[PDB]
Every structure is written in C-alpha cells, then in structure tokens.
C-alpha cells in the first residue's frame, strides 16, 4: 500500500493550489481597502478574509489525520506542522467564542479610550494624537506625568479583568494543543525538532534571551548612566543621580524607545547630523527617485531588481484626491508574487531610509517565493526586520550618501560626528531591548503561574526597576494593567521577536562587513558594491522556513547560537566614550528610589 | 502558394487549458517560422532538436502546434527531461523532442480583474504521461485504499485544478499563452517544405 507521508505529499499538494487564490484573493481586498477607503471596500475585504479563514481552519482540522510520528520526510514533515497548529480550533464553541469577543473587545478599546487631567475637563484626548504628541515631545514634568496615569488609569483597569479572563482561556487553549501555557505557545516559534546538532528547545529560548542579555548589561548600565545624567539637565529636582529613570521621561508612552529623547542628551550639540533633506529636494529628487536610489543601493550588492508590478500597482506616492488613505510604511507580499509598497512618501531623509526598510522586507519575501507555501516565511519571527534594518544601516552611511551624488565629496565625517550618529543609534536600538526582555519575561511567568493573579502589577514594576532601570511614578495596586497599555500586550502579540531581531541584524551586519572586507570600526562599514555579502545573505534568504533558523542563521554567521559580540562590537566606540565621561558619576540604577516618596 | 494557417494557431482568439491542450496538426504547407522567431513578440522560444536557425531547409511529414496556457515559472517545465506538474501529469516531452516552445506573456488577454479561472490544469494522477498523451479523465483520483463512492471525502481529491489568473500577478505566476511546435519525419513524401 502507501504510507503516511505519500499521503501527506498529496494532501499538501492540494492544499497549497487553494490555499494560494484563497489568500492573494484576501490581499487584494485588504489592499484595495488599503489604497482607498470606502465602505464597500470593508464588505469585500471581510468576505474575502472570512474565506480565506474558514478554508484554512478545515484544512488544518483535516491535516491532523496525519501524525507526524509516521513521517520521515522533514520538508513536508515542517508544511504539515505548520498546518496542524489548531488555534482555538480546540475549546467548545461557547468559549471559542468567548475569547474571539474578549479578543475584539480588548482591542477596540486601547484604540477608542481616552484621557483627561483634571484643571482642564475639556482636554480629554486619544492615545493618538494626544498623548502621542504629550509623550513624544513635551519636556514638562506634570505634562507627561498626567498623561502617563491617565492612559494606565482610564484604559489598563478596563483591560484588567478581560485580560485576566484571557490569560484564562489562552492557557486552557494551550493546554488543549498540547503545550504548558500560552508562553510555552508563544516560544514554540523557536522549537526546532528533526534535525540533529541544530534542535533548539522552548526552554533553550529562555536560557538564551538570559544570557545575551547579561552581556549587554554593561554596555546598557553605561548608556543608562549617561542618559541619566544628560537628564537631569532638563530635570534638574525630578531625578535622583544614582537611581533609575521615569517611565514617563523616556521619549514615549511606554519608554520602548529613547529616540525621542535624542534632542536632550546629545553629544555635541553645535555640530548638525547628516540631513540631507535639503540637498534633495535641491537636486530635484521626488519619490520615484527615492525608489530607484534604493534599488540602485540593493543592486550594487547582487540583489534582484525590483519586479515591474511594483513600479506600476505600488502606492509609492500619496493620492491626496479622494481617498482616505491609511498610509504606513508596509511591504506587500500579494500572494502570487505582486510585491508592492504602500508608503506615503516624502522628500525628505526618514523617508529615504524608511524606503530601504520596506525595499529590504520585499527582497526577504521575493527571495523565498520559491519555497512551498506553508514554508513561505522567514526563518523565525526575527529574520525579516532584521533584514529590514541592515539594509538602512548600510544606506544611512556618509560613504553612501557621499557614493550616489548627494553628499558633496568635499566632506569629512568629524570625530564627532561617528558620537552622535553611535548615541542616536543607542538611543533607538539599545534602549528597547531591556524593556522588550522584561516585557517577555513577566509574560512568560504569567503565563506558567510563577506570579499569581494578586502580583500581576508587584512583579511588573519589579521587574522593571530590576531589569530596565526604570521605576513608576506613582505607585499603581493590582488593578492596573499596566502592561495593557502597550499596543502588543492588549491585542495580543508576541514581543520577543523586537529582542532577537536586534541582535541578529549586527550578526549579519558584521559577517557581512566582513565578507566585504571592510576595515574600521563597525558603524561606518557600507556593504553596497560587494556581490559577495550580496549573495552571501541571497543563500540564507531563499531559504525561508524550510531548514532550522538555527542552520539558518549558521549559514550567515557562522554561529549556530543567537550571539551579541557583534552588538556589543558595534557600539564600541561609544562604550568607550560612555565610559571616559561616566568617571565622576555612578553606573547603576538602585531599585530603593521612588520619584513618589 | 502554399500559405500556412498560421493564424488560427498564434493569432487565436481561445486557448485550452493545459490539462486539455489544443492540438492542431498542419501539413501541405511551404512555412515561414522566421515571420515569428523574427518578431520580438515572444518571452521564451527554445528549440530542441533542430536549430533555432531560419529553418528554411527542412522538409516535415506533418507539423503539431499545442497549444495551451500556463503560468510563468511552468514554462521551465515545457522542456526534454523536466519533472514537474505540468511535464508528469499535464504535457509530457519525450526526449526525442524534435521541435520547439513558443511562450508570451498574456497578462492581458487571460487575466482579468477578479481573477480568471476558466484554465485547468491536472494536479494528480496515478501515475505518469505517455509521449504527447492527453489525459481528460475526471476520475476522482483516490490516494488511500477507501473508495470516494464517485464523491470527495477522506483521501479524495479532484484531478483538476483552476489556474487563479489575475491582472496584477507577478511575473512568476502570471499567464502565459504556449505553443509547443513538434515537426514529425516519418516514410511520407515530406509534403511539407519551406522555401
Ligand atoms: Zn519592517
């Protein structure tokens, strides 16, 4: 007779030609919806979306007739595991349901609540704009403050009590799927199995998160310090010099980032960055022209030219006549090829790197296009931004922007201008990745049951003075839900993808560098005219999730482990510069202090 | 003189799907393949067997033209010694192709704005093609031992599948008109020669 896995071959191979029209029928719609607004457009877009759905949860429920005991074969064994994740396919009708409307519920309502302080009753606006604006640019110590209690206050104790029934239901249904809890769920996007010297556990991800992070807290203690003490010029009786900063005087709502706090602890003040804003619109550049510099960027380093469908059904410039475009910066990768680009483009220089980004997303989607369907997807949940930022990280050089003709070749990069640039860099790259950690972690152990229900908010803020350096400014009781309050946390995604994305990019940066040969510190290394690293990172990409991201990321690096040394190696300058002006001053944070009292 | 029906084979208004692939046999002709090889109107022109040269030596008992439609990155697999879908279950090639593949891209005729899916291709079978075979049989093609009682079920897929051709549609799977000319020499009078 047959076996399981000629079985399996041919319901995979019928899976895949439905599964196809199923789901370049369902982005068409969200993209017609996408590029114009109408109420119509909504209609077509949840049926399609609704099809596409339903067809996929019956033939998830019908690919788990197979066991994967019986098969041998690991290229249909990883399509057939990825096809049997059931979801909430699992729990009675009654609470499959429940948890799709507790679901909805908490997310529409982080995007409807709103704030108000008292002295001003009117003033009572949205996350967006009004405390995005209030977070982001304000320097006032009141001013953030009431708008930081508001959002927790107005908008987490709503979500308490439906997170804590979604806890709830999410560890039943992991349960149910044969895992511990919803975290255990959560990690098993890094559980490798059917390979031997490349099998990586859920338990092994834990380990590794902890270890890389003991690496880079120095380099974060000194950056931390320094932040500090550039602080307390603009704060100079709202922070103590050897405790731990406001959550609430991080340049965001949450303090996920410190880019915003770049205009306040700036090295060198009186020399500029490098704008070249103006220098392009001088020389006439338009967004087209912004495209064509990015592909010309790509090219010179042996990646494919962008395809002809992108240059013609890419919302590459705004419409601004009809149309109430949704227009953030996202690549499209429409089912049967149709690689497209959404962004409303400017003239200016976020722009010109931000194009790079989503150019760098198409040619990860473009390059594993090849791979069956199911496996059509990056090695893990890390691979694709982390191809994203090296290829802005490459374009952002003064070597690059001096190379294409829009720096004069008359410049010198100052001794002070790599400081800057290396802060900057800090700033946005270095200042997530505790909090993304920590993040994690308090999910992790909510999730298993280390913290019980009446310490959700006790070991949150702990972890948080313990491990990001960062401490409430009023104290919050356990109805809170501070961690609610993050777009990720209260619509349910998983967070630890930002923490190993950042430190595979300067795995492959560095390897890339060095496969380019270049010689000098890592922070002006420029891959672009090298074919080597080109096609050096073309044979990981093409690759997708059809062999262990473990081998995966071997092929690039050469490391099999998630490694920090070149993380560690790219900020050393500005390690050594932290450390030169972190001489009359204490690195550390002590947990004792409270900006409350 | 001798004017060839070129017309009704590349200047079609229909093509067949490639699971039922139109065969048109000419013969009593002086042709003239450099009208089209020098055209510039193709994608992909490949010619085993005998030369894309101007080919205007060669005496031919009969000529087949089959004719069907595709998506891109199947053209590949119209060739001598290629596995794949459409060369195991759909249009087979023996290794003794004497003759060529003509390929253009249809994005424009085949594929319109919702998705065009009156092309079908065989997607399973039991087992491979004989030479230049057609297979129209709508047999439910049973994979395990329980029987589909003429219905779909457990282990019971259909044999056919709709290409999902639309406008946008990238490159790769984008529609794609083929014609495959195979030029037969047997104990004939060679009745078809050109100039
Ligand atoms: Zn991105």
Same mark, same amino acid.
């Given at each position: ?50 099809? #596409? ?56 309502? /982080? ?38 209690? %508001? ?34 769920? $959560? ?10 010297? /490349? ?54 709502? #949450? ?46 380093? %042996? ?74 997807? %990056? ?25 294409? %003709? ?22 946005? @790259? ?25 310490? $959700? ?119 050594? $510069? ?20 | ?24 046999? @000419? ?42 439609? @595709? ?32 390929? $253009? ?91």
């Amino acid at each position: 007779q047959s076996t399981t896995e000629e079985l399996a071959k041919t319901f995979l191979e019928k899976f895949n030609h439905e599964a196809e029209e199923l789901s370049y029928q369902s982005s068409l719609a969200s993209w017609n919806y996408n590029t114009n607004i109408t109420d119509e457009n909504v209609q077509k877009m949840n049926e399609a979306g609704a099809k #596409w759905s339903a067809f996929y949860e019956e033939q998830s429920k019908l690919a788990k007739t197979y066991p994967l005991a019986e098969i041998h074969n690991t290229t249909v064994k990883r399509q057939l595991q990825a096809l049997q994740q059931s979801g909430s396919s699992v729990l009675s009708a009654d609470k499959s349901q429940r948890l799709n409307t507790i679901l909805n519920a908490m997310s529409t309502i /982080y995007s409807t609540g709103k704030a108000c302080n008292p002295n001003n009753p009117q003033e009572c606006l949205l996350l967006e704009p009004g405390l995005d604006d209030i977070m982001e640019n304000s320097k006032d110590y009141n001013e953030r403050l009431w708008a930081w209690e %508001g959002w927790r206050a107005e908008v987490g104790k709503q979500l308490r009590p439906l997170y804590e029934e979604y806890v709830a239901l999410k560890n039943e249904m992991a349960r149910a799927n044969n895992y511990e809890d919803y975290g255990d769920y $959560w990690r098993g996007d890094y559980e490798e199995e059917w390979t031997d010297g /490349y099998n990586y556990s859920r338990s092994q991800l834990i380990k590794d998160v902890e270890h890389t992070f003991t690496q880079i807290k120095p380099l974060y203690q000194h950056l931390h310090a320094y932040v500090r003490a550039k602080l307390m010029d603009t704060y100079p009786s709202r922070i103590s010099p050897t405790g731990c900063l406001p959550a609430h005087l991080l340049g965001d709502m #949450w303090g996920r980032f410190w880019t915003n706090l770049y205009p306040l602890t700036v090295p060198f003040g009186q020399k500029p960055n490098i704008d070249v804003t103006d220098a392009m619109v001088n020389q006439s550049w338009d967004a087209r022209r912004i495209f064509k510099e990015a592909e010309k960027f790509f090219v010179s380093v %042996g990646l494919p030219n962008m395809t002809q469908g992108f240059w013609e059904n890419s919302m590459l410039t705004e419409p601004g006549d009809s149309r109430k475009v949704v227009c953030h910066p996202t690549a499209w990768d429409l089912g049967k090829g149709d690689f497209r680009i959404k962004m409303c483009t400017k003239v200016t220089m976020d722009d010109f790197l931000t194009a790079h980004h989503e150019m760098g997303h198409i040619q990860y989607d473009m390059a594993y296009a090849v791979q069956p369907f199911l496996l059509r997807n %990056g090695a893990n949940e890390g691979f694709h931004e982390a191809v994203g930022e090296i290829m802005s990280l490459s374009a952002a050089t003064p070597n690059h922007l001096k190379t294409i %003709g829009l720096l004069s070749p008359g410049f010198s990069e100052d001794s002070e201008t790599e400081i800057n640039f290396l802060l900057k860099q800090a700033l946005t @790259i270095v200042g997530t990745l505790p909090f993304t950690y920590m993040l994690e972690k308090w999910r992790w152990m909510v999730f298993k049951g280390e913290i019980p229900k009446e310490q $959700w908010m006790q070991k949150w803020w702990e972890m948080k003075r313990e491990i990001v350096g960062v401490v409430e400014p009023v104290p919050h009781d356990e109805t809170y839900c501070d961690p609610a309050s993050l777009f990720h946390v209260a619509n349910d995604y998983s967070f630890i993808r930002y923490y190993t994305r950042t430190i595979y990019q300067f795995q492959f940066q560095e390897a890339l560098c060095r496969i380019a040969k270049h010689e000098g510190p890592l922070h002006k290394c420029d891959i672009s005219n090298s074919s080597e690293a080109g096609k050096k990172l073309l044979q990981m990409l093409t690759l997708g999730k059809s062999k262990p991201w473990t081998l995966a990321l071997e092929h690039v690096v050469g490391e099999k482990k998630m490694n920090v040394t070149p993380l560690l190696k790219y900020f050393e300058p500005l390690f050594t $510069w932290l450390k030169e002006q972190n001489r009359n001053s204490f690195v550390g944070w002590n947990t004792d202090w409270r900006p409350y009292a | 003189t001798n004017l060839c029906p070129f017309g009704e084979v590349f200047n079609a208004t229909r093509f067949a799907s490639v699971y039922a692939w139109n065969r048109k046999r @000419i013969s009593n002709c002086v042709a003239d393949y450099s009208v089209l090889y020098n055209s510039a109107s193709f994608s992909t022109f490949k010619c085993y067997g005998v030369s894309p040269t101007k080919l205007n030596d060669l005496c031919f008992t009969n000529v087949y033209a089959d004719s069907f439609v @595709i998506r891109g990155d199947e053209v590949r697999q119209i060739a001598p010694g290629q596995t794949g879908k459409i060369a195991d279950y759909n249009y087979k090639l023996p290794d003794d192709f004497t003759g060529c593949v003509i390929a $253009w891209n249809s994005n424009n005729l085949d594929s319109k704005v919702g998705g065009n899916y009156n092309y079908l291709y065989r997607l399973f079978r039991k087992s491979n093609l004989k030479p230049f075979e057609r297979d129209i049989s709508t047999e439910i093609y049973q994979a395990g031992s329980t029987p589909c009682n003429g219905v779909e079920g457990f282990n019971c897929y259909f044999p056919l599948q709709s290409y999902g051709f639309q406008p946008t549609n990238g490159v790769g799977y984008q529609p794609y008109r083929v014609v495959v000319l195979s030029f037969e020499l047997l104990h004939a009078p060679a009745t078809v020669c050109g100039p």
